[PDB]
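Quick entry between incubations.
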Amino acid sequence: SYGEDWGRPLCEDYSGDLFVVQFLSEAVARGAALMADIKYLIRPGAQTDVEHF
Amino acid sequence: YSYVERTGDGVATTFNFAFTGKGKGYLLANQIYVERWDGASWQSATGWSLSGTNQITFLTPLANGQVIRIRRIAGKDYPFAQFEPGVMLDMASLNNTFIHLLEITQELLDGFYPDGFYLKQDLNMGWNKIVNLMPGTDGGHAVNKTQLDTLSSHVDDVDQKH
Amino acid sequence: QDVPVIGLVHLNLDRYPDFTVEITNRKSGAVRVAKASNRVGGARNNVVGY
Amino acid sequence: QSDTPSIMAESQFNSLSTKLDAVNLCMRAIGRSGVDNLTSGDLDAEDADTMIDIVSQRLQYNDGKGWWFNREPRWSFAPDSNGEVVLPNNTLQVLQAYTLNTRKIDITIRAGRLYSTTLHSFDVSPLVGPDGFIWLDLMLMLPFEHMPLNVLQAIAYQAAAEFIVSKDADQTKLQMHMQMAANLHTGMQVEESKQNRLNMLVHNPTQRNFGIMAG
Amino acid sequence: SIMAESQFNSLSTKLDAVNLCMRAIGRSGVDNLTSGDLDAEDADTMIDIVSQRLQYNDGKGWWFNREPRWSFAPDSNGEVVLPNNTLQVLQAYTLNTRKIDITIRAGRLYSTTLHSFDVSPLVGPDGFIWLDLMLMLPFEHMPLNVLQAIAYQAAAEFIVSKDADQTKLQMHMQMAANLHTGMQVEESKQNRLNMLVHNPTQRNFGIMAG
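Done. Structure below.
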């Protein structure tokens, strides 16, 4: 730019878009990992015994 | 009158107070308020319980020479009883109301005033004394002649070394 | 044994001065006093005279 | 000349603000008229007094937080050299302050003074903040007075319904009071968020952080 | 030879509202507001209770209750005192004014964040203080529609304070709501507003791109 001793990079012009991509990728990866987990559940008063199952 | 001063020392944990008037001297338990003297300020106290009609009980014994003050503050904004036609008119309310209205004036005679109080008019004392003042720190504070004597002493020493 | 729980008691009177009603309990022993007066606001018998 | 000062000077609204009027209102829908004095000698007079006091903090607490007047932002206690700090007067609940660079430490309120479970020491010297006086958020209990006019009406009707069901057993009177008081509570709770307004952005840490970037 | 009845128009007078409240129970209204009948007082109180309650309605009140921006200018001593009865008080939301919490204690207001009872540090730049509030004007000098609406609602509640037939209760409650929505449409007719110009984001979008 005029009156500038040093230049500027190209990625400076799209840092915002890159940050948006980073945020969305983090969100989708975290959601996939969180859904990949397994936790199971049994209803109280199950009338069944878990150890034999 | 209303306010009562008490000193505490030793194992003593129960303090008795007496107010002017019939019976217990007060209308509501909410009128009783407890204060503790820290030696510098009018700090309030905690851990007090009303055990008797005219006595209070602390949880722990007071320390050496601790000073407490039991006062009684009445309702400052409404009359004690509100009268309407068609209500069960009882005479006890009339007796209590007069005592309560007499009570609101009582501590004013003692010397208590609500916080945020200032005489906004030009007061006069008709050539009477003002006594028992401390030296003032800030410029807005008034000064006794103890400072005046100190300043008079100060001008003397500077003049004598002159 | 099947005893109702009394909520309020209404007394019908024709001539009455101020009086008191004493309540006593045979189990706790506490006593409660309810004081009644003949002065009721807005009534004829409210003049300071009589 | 003119008549505006003359005519409406006599006008009277007579709004309800005293605790006794709430008791007198609570003393209706039940039979006998209200008492002229708060103390009096009638047993039902102080029974209504107890109801107002009990229902006070119940209503003021809502579920979790109360209204805006119960809010009390960042405090400083600076616990004494003797030991732990005593909680001022009566507090409904105590929460930790949530400023930056402040680790989560447990605070639990016992009688007055608080207790930290993780330390298991009833005195809390070491968990004091760096040059900070254990900043935390709490909620006082205002008395029946020192409250807005609307909440006074809300607490009275709610207490009246509880008094009726304890005292009497009537479906019609009870049904109206419960329904009508609930109408006022929603009609009053609606403005609580309308007051001290907050929005999705800015306040939410992740939304504000996203807003600053890519913008 | 006889006083007769003075002409009444609609129900402007408070006494006539009590007479309507006295009715619906088979007893007629008293001629004088004070009189010596104990039941007129219960009706008299009931009108008073509803007035403070019905004007505030749900959240903000009607068009005549609310008052625009004021100026309080807290003194040198400290906080400023709210006038008589204020249903609710809010800070003015104009531009270049930071949002500072205002809370009303008994009478005069309070500041939770400053935690002090006075509000002196919260004086704005070159403007003392600006806030919005609503009064509760008394039973008289009212729009005539509220006068009839308030009477039926209070009378309907009055029924069930004293024994009333199911028939009398159900009709009055139905009409009290019906009369309430009858006046509520006029609220939009007065001080009418739209998304445009009024909404900050809609006006901002409107001026740009055009």
